[PDB]
Tab-separated table of C-alpha atoms and ligand atoms in Angstrom:
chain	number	residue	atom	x	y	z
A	26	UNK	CA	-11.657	22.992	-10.393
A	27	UNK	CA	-9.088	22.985	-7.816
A	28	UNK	CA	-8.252	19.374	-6.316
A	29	UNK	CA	-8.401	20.554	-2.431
A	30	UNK	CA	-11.205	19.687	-0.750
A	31	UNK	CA	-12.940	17.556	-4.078
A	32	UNK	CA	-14.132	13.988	-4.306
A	33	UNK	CA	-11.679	13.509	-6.805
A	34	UNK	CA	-9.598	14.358	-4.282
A	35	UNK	CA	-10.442	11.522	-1.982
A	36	UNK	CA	-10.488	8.821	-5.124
A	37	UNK	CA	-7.420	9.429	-5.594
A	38	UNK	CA	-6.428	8.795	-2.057
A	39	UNK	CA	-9.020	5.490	-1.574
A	40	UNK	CA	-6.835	4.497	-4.907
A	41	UNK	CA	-3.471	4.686	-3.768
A	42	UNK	CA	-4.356	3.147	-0.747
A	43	UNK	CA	-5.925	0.074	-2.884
A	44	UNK	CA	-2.943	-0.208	-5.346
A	45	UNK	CA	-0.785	0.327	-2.554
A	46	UNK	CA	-1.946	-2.914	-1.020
A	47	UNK	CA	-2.244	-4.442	-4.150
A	48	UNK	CA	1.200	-4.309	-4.918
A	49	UNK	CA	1.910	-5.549	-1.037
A	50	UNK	CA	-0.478	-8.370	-1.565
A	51	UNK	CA	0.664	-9.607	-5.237
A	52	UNK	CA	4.110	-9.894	-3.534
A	53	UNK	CA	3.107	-11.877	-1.003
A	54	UNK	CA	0.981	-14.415	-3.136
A	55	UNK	CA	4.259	-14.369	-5.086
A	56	UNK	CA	6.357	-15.719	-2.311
A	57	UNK	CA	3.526	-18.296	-1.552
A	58	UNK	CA	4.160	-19.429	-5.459
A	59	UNK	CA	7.712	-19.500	-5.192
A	60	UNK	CA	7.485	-22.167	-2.129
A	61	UNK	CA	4.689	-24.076	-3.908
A	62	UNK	CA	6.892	-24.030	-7.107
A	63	UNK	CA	4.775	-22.136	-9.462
A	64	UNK	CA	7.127	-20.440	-10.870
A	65	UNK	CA	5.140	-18.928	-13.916
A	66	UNK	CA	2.258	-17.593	-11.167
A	67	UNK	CA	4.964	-15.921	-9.083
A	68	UNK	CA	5.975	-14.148	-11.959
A	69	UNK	CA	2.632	-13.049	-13.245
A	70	UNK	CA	2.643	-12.106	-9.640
A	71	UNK	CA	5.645	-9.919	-9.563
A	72	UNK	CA	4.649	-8.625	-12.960
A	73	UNK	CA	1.003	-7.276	-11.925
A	74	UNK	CA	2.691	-5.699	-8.628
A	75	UNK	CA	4.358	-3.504	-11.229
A	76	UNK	CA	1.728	-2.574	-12.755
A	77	UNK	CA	0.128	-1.326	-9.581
A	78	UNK	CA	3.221	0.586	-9.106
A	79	UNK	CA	2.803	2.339	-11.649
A	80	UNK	CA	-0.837	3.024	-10.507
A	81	UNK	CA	-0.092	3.869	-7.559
A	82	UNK	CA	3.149	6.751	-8.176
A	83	UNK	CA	0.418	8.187	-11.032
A	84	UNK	CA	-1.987	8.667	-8.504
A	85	UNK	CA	0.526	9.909	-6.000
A	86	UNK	CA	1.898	12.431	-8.776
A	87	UNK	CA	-2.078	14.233	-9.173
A	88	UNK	CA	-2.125	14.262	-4.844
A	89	UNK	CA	1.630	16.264	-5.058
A	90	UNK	CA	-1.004	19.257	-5.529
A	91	UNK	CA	-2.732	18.854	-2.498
A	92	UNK	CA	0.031	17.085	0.174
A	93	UNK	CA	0.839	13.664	1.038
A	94	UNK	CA	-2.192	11.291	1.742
A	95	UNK	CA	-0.188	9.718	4.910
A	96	UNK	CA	0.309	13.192	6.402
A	97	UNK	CA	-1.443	16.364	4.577
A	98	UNK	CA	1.894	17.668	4.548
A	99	UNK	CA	3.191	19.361	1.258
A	100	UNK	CA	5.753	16.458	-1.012
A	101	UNK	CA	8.172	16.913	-3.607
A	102	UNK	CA	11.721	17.859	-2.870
A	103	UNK	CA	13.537	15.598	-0.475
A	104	UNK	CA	13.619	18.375	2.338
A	105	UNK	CA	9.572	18.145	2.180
A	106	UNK	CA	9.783	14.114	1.660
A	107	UNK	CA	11.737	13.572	4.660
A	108	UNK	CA	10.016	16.032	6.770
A	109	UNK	CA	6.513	14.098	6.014
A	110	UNK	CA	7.830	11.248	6.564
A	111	UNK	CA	9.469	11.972	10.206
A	112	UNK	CA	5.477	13.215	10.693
A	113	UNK	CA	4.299	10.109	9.441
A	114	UNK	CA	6.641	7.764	11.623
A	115	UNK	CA	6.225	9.742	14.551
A	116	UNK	CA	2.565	9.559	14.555
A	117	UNK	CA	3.063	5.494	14.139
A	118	UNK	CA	5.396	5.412	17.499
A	119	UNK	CA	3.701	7.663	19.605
A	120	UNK	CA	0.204	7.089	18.800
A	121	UNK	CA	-1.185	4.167	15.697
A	122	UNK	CA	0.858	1.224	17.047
A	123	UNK	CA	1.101	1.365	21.189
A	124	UNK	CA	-2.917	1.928	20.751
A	125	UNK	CA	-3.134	-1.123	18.616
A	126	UNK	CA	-0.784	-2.590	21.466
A	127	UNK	CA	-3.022	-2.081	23.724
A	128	UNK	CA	-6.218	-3.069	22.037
A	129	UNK	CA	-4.848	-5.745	20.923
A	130	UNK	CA	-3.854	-6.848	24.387
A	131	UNK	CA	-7.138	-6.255	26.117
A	132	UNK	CA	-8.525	-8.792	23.558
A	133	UNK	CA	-6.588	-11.288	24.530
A	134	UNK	CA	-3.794	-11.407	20.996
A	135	UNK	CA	-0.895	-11.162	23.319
A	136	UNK	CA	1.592	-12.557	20.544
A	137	UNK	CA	-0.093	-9.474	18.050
A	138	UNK	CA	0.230	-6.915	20.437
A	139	UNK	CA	3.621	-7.682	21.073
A	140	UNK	CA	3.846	-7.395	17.442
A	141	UNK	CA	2.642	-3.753	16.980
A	142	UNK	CA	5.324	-2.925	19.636
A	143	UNK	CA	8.160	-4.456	17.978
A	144	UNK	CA	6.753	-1.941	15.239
A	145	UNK	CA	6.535	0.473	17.214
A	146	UNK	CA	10.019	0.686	17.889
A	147	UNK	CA	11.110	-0.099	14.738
A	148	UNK	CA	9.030	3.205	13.760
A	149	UNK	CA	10.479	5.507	16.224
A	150	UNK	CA	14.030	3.386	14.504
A	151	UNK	CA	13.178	5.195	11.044
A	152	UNK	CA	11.557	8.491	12.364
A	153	UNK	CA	14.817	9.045	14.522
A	154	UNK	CA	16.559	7.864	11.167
A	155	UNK	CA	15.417	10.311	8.869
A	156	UNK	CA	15.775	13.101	11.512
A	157	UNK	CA	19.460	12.432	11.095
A	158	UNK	CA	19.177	12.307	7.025
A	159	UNK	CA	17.604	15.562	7.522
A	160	UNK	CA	19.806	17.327	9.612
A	161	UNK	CA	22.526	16.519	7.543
A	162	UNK	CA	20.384	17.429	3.973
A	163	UNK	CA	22.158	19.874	1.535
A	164	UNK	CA	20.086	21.183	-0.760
X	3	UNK	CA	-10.174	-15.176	21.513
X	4	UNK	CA	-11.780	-15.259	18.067
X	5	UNK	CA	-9.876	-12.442	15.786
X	6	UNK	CA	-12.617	-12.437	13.387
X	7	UNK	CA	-14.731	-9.648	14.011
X	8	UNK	CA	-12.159	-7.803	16.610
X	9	UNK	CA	-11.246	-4.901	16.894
X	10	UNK	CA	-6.861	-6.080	16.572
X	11	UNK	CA	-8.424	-7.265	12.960
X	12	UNK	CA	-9.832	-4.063	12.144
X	13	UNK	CA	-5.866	-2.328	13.331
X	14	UNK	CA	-4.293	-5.126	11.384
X	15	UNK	CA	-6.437	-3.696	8.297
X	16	UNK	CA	-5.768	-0.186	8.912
X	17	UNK	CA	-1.888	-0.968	10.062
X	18	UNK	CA	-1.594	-2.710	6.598
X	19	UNK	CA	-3.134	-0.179	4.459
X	20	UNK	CA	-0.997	2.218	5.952
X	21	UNK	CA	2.386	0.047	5.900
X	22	UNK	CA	1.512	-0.482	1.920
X	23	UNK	CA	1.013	3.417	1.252
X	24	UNK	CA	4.386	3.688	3.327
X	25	UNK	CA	6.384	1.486	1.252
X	26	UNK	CA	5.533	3.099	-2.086
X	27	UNK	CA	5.491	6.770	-0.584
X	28	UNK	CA	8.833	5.791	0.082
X	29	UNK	CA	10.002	5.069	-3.221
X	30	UNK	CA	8.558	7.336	-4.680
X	31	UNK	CA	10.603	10.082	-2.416
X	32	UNK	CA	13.705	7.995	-3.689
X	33	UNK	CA	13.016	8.476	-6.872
X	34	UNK	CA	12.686	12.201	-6.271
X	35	UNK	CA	16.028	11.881	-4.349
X	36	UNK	CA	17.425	10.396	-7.384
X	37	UNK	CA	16.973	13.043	-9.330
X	38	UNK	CA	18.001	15.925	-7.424
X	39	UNK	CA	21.326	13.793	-6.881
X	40	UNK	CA	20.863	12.922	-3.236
X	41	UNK	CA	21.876	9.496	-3.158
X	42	UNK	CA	22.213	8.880	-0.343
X	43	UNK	CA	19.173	10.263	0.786
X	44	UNK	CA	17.438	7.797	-1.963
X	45	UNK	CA	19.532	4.848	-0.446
X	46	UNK	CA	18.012	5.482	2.889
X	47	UNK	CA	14.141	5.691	1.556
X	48	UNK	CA	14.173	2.122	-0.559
X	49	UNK	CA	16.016	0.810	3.042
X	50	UNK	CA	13.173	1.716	4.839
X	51	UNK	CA	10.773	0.850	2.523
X	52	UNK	CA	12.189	-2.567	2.699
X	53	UNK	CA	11.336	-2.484	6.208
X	54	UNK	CA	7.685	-0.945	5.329
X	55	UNK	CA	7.306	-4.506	3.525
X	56	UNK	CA	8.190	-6.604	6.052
X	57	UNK	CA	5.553	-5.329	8.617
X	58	UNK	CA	3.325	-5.364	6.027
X	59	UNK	CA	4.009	-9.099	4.992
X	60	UNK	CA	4.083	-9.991	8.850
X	61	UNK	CA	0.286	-7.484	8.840
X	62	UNK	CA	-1.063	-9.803	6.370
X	63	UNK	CA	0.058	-13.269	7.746
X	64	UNK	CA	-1.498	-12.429	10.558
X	65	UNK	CA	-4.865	-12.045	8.929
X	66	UNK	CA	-4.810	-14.987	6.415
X	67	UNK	CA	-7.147	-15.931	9.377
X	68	UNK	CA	-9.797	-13.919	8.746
X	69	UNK	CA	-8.970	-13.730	4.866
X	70	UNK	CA	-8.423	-10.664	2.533
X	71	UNK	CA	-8.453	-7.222	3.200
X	72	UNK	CA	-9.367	-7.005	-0.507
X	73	UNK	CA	-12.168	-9.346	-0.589
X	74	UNK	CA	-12.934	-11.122	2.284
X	75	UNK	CA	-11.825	-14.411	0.537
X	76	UNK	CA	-9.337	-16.613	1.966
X	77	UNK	CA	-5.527	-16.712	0.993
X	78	UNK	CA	-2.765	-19.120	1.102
X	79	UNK	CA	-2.191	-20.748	-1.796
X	80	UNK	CA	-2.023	-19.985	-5.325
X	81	UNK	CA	-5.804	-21.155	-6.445
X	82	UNK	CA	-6.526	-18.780	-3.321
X	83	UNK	CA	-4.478	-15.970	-4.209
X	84	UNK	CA	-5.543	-15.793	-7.593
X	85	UNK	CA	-9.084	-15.713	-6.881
X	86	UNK	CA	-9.039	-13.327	-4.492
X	87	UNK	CA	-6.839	-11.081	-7.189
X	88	UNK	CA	-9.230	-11.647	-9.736
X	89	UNK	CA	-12.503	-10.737	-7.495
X	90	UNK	CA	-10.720	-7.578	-6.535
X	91	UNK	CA	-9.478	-6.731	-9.904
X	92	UNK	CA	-13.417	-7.208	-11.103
X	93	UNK	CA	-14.321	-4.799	-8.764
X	94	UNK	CA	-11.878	-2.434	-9.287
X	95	UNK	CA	-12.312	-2.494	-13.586
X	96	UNK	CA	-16.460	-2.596	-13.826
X	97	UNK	CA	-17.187	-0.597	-10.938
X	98	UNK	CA	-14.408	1.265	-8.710
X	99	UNK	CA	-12.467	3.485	-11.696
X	100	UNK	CA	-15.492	3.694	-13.903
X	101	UNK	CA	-17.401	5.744	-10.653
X	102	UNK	CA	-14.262	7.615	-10.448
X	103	UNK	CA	-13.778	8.629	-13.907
X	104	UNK	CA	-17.054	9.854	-13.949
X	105	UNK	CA	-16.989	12.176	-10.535
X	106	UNK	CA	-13.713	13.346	-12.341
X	107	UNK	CA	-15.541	13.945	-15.330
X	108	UNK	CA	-18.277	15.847	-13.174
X	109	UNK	CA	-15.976	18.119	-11.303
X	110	UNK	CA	-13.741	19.264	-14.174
X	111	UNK	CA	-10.622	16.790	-13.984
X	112	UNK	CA	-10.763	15.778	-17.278
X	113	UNK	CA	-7.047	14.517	-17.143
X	114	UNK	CA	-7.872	12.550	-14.232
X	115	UNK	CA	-10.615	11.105	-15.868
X	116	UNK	CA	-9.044	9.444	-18.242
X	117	UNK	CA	-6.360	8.750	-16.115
X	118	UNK	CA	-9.043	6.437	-14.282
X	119	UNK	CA	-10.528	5.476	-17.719
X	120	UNK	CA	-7.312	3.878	-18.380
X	121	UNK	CA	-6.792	2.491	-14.969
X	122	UNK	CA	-10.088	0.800	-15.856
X	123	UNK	CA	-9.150	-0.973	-18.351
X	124	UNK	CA	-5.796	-1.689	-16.958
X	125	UNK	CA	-7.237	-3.624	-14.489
X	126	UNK	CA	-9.784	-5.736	-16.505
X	127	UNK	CA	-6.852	-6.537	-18.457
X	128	UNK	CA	-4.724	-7.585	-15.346
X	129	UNK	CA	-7.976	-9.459	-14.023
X	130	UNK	CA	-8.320	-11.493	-17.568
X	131	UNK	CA	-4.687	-12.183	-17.284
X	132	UNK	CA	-4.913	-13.656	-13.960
X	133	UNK	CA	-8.418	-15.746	-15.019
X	134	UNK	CA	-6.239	-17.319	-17.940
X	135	UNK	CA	-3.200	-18.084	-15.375
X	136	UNK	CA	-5.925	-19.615	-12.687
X	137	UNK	CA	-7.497	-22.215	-15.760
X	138	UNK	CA	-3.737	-23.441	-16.574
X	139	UNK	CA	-2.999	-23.864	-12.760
X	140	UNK	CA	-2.487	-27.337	-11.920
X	141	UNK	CA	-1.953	-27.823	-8.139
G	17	FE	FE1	-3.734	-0.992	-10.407
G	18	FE	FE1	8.503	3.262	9.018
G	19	FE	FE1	6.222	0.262	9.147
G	20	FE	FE1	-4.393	-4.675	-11.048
């Protein structure tokens, strides 16, 4: 049984993409609690979302075998984390969010599309940024 | 221009499943950073993962028109949120990470397999937990 190219495989990814989001989402139902002044839901909230951290960076530690589900790339060290990332980020920039830009524009969401760009710059922001961690990485 | 149904609500899905995974890649690879002693580099990853939540949090307002990416149910406010929570946590206990347990099982990832065995029943304790918290909510 190796974990390349197994259904297992793509579980775990289809997992930590759910208690990714999970996490995201509990925090933001948090937030709606703390305006509405339940206090003892936002912290069930905030409680859960670490639960689903903890999920999520298990599930993450089985994919280290088989590369980073954002990228493919190999993860571990920093040199390898920063590298995916920049791969990641750049892919956001140059390709995911100026599509959605555009799509999103030709639909008539002018406020969203302007939206993904504002991402989109503030992804090439952090790809450019960890290019300079990089370059300057001892290890 | 209706969003439900569009194709900007289908990138707003994607873009926020992505965002989610980005933010807890990202601390993960801090953590690494942490231990190998490169602070800084580990100051840098929970910085941008800060920013990961944001676009995330501004993904998801954005579709609290259409409703949850978890569910389909609408969000907003607390009796909302935790509904939508529990329905997804239902899913995820009696159906999601008992199939995956058992491919696990199938393939010869035993560890795994209990890893989503336990995950199971994680969840069905997270989704009683937030059934109890809905019946004492008084909005
Ligand atoms: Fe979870
Ligand atoms: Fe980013
Ligand atoms: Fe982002
Ligand atoms: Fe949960």
């Amino acid at each position: 049984a190796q974990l390349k190219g197994s259904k297992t495989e793509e579980n775990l990814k289809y997992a930590f993409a759910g208690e990714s989001q999970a996490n995201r989402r509990y925090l933001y139902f948090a937030s709606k609690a703390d305006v509405e002044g339940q206090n003892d839901i936002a912290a069930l909230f905030r409680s859960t979302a670490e639960g689903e951290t903890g999920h999520a960076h298990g599930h993450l530690e089985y994919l280290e075998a088989v590369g980073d589900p954002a990228t493919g790339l190999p993860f571990g060290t920093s040199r390898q984390n920063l590298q995916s990332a920049i791969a990641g980020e750049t892919h956001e920039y140059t390709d995911m969010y100026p599509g959605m830009a555009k799509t999103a524009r030709d639909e008539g969401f002018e406020e969203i599309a302007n939206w993904f760009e504002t991402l989109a710059k503030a992804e090439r922001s952090h790809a450019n940024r960890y290019t300079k961690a990089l370059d300057g990485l001892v290890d």
